[PDB]
Scaffold this active site. Sequence first.
Site, PDB file in Angstrom:
ATOM      1  N   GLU A  54      10.681   3.885   2.998  1.00 27.24           N
ATOM      2  CA  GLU A  54      11.449   5.059   2.374  1.00 27.24           C
ATOM      3  C   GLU A  54      12.711   4.924   1.740  1.00 27.24           C
ATOM      4  O   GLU A  54      13.627   5.114   2.007  1.00 27.24           O
ATOM      5  CB  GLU A  54      11.728   6.101   3.249  1.00 27.24           C
ATOM      6  CG  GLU A  54      10.382   6.365   4.499  1.00 27.24           C
ATOM      7  CD  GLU A  54      10.940   7.053   5.702  1.00 27.24           C
ATOM      8  OE1 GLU A  54      11.919   7.045   6.303  1.00 27.24           O
ATOM      9  OE2 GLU A  54       9.979   8.138   6.039  1.00 27.24           O
ATOM     10  N   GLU A  92       3.182   2.705  -3.410  1.00 23.33           N
ATOM     11  CA  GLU A  92       2.742   3.585  -2.267  1.00 23.33           C
ATOM     12  C   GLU A  92       1.200   3.556  -1.801  1.00 23.33           C
ATOM     13  O   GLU A  92       0.300   3.166  -2.638  1.00 23.33           O
ATOM     14  CB  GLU A  92       2.375   4.808  -3.194  1.00 23.33           C
ATOM     15  CG  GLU A  92       4.171   5.328  -3.647  1.00 23.33           C
ATOM     16  CD  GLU A  92       4.556   6.508  -3.091  1.00 23.33           C
ATOM     17  OE1 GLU A  92       4.275   6.718  -1.840  1.00 23.33           O
ATOM     18  OE2 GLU A  92       5.630   7.126  -3.702  1.00 23.33           O
ATOM     19  N   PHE A  93       0.861   3.470  -0.479  1.00 25.09           N
ATOM     20  CA  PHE A  93       0.203   3.425   0.341  1.00 25.09           C
ATOM     21  C   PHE A  93      -0.834   4.716   0.563  1.00 25.09           C
ATOM     22  O   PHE A  93      -0.335   5.386   1.378  1.00 25.09           O
ATOM     23  CB  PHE A  93       0.107   2.786   1.778  1.00 25.09           C
ATOM     24  CG  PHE A  93      -1.071   2.146   2.404  1.00 25.09           C
ATOM     25  CD1 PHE A  93      -2.344   2.706   2.023  1.00 25.09           C
ATOM     26  CD2 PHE A  93      -0.952   1.224   3.059  1.00 25.09           C
ATOM     27  CE1 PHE A  93      -3.465   2.461   2.579  1.00 25.09           C
ATOM     28  CE2 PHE A  93      -2.087   0.422   3.731  1.00 25.09           C
ATOM     29  CZ  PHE A  93      -3.402   1.060   3.312  1.00 25.09           C
ATOM     30  N   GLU A  94      -1.715   5.254  -0.530  1.00 26.39           N
ATOM     31  CA  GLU A  94      -2.098   6.714  -0.262  1.00 26.39           C
ATOM     32  C   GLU A  94      -3.280   6.736   0.586  1.00 26.39           C
ATOM     33  O   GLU A  94      -4.354   6.305   0.151  1.00 26.39           O
ATOM     34  CB  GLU A  94      -2.274   6.829  -1.607  1.00 26.39           C
ATOM     35  CG  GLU A  94      -1.322   8.002  -2.210  1.00 26.39           C
ATOM     36  CD  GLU A  94      -1.143   9.083  -1.605  1.00 26.39           C
ATOM     37  OE1 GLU A  94      -1.893   9.413  -0.761  1.00 26.39           O
ATOM     38  OE2 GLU A  94      -0.113   9.661  -1.684  1.00 26.39           O
ATOM     39  N   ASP A 116       7.603   4.871  -0.541  1.00 31.71           N
ATOM     40  CA  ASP A 116       7.042   4.520   0.556  1.00 31.71           C
ATOM     41  C   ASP A 116       7.316   3.009   1.351  1.00 31.71           C
ATOM     42  O   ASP A 116       7.899   2.526   1.943  1.00 31.71           O
ATOM     43  CB  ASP A 116       5.572   4.670   0.595  1.00 31.71           C
ATOM     44  CG  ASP A 116       4.862   4.418   1.828  1.00 31.71           C
ATOM     45  OD1 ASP A 116       5.359   4.518   2.834  1.00 31.71           O
ATOM     46  OD2 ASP A 116       3.528   4.272   1.592  1.00 31.71           O
TER      47      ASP A 116
END
Lengths: 208, 198
Positions: free
Chosen positions: B77, B111-113, B94
Amino acid sequence: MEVEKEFITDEAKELLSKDKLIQQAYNEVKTSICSPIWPATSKTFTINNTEKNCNGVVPIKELCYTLLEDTYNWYREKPLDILKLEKKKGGPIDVYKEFIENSELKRVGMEFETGNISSAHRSMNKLLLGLKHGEIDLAIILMPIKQLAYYLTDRVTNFEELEPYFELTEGQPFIFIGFNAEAYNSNVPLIPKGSDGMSKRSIKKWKD
Amino acid sequence: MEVEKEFITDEAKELLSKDKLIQQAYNEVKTSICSPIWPATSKTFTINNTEKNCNGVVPIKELCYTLLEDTYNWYREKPLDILKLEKKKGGPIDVYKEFIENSELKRVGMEFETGNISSAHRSMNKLLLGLKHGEIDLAIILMPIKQLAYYLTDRVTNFEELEPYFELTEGQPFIFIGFNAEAYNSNVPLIPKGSDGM
DNA sequence: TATGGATCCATA
DNA sequence: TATGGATCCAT
């Protein structure tokens, strides 16, 4: 419905001031988005404000689409060549129309976003992509404003939440329109969710 | 878990060739993404293939973040100044990490989507915004490939579905990595689901 | 193994 | 508050 917020890129402003076919497009769009009413017998759109996210989004777009398709001759599901033909992956554009006057032709692509806010980024990129590949001359995204969305399905697209990203369409002609109800009240009926709010109209598909 | 597909903008290729800080961020994420195992006793990632979309997605990320954070020291964050400070609207990135070495700093956001495919576009855009504003030097997105996604909650980000939009990052240093399970077998337990939306 | 969506979740 | 996410739906 009333249009209460709008963001016009510089490129779209230039076309909006000199170009009559664009001027025409924009007018058909504005008029179409201002047409939704609730309830059906009223002359304005009043939304039920009993509680947070109390209303579904489906029926809100009906009268907008009908006007574009039946009175203005816009089509639904126009696919982009870069997607259908070249990449062979990716769906089409919500609304589309070719505006012609003697030698001139202008193609406009548009998406009326009521899905989750994340979907709007998709619509945005998708229009970005057809603009960059020369398939459309102007891109339009219609959505509610935050105040209105407070009373709609949770997390649907709202102008204010997409607004920090408008900057990613710079260098292209794009218009962002945020619409709001004309009144809030709990005397009106709730817009239904689910199957019940489902549209049952035949749509004017490009393939026809 | 395995890394099966990858798309590296030419801009990221350059860095990956010349930058040691960049190569280090890269090997870290690779190691971490190759981390997840299932079940918890296994040495590999085995996915129950009973039916289409039968597995949930949450517990998949756990072990990858853990390595990043606990072993490699990345932070979760991280807000971007353009959003928290300037535009005063928007959430954070993220995973983020500053690579400092000598007079050098390399800022990587990632970003781990595993959210809906639609989300992936939000992540891609938010990372393009940080790049455009000079807040990060490399952006990376990790996602499942279609084959694995088939067994996950319907419509989760999958490499192949985002793929037609990679070109939207052109001119920017970006990395898309698609992972796959080491095997499929109906005898391992199902990854549980939550009660989200519907 | 296609694809845009519509809806609710959890943690501030 | 506001925000990223997860989960099924309809054609």
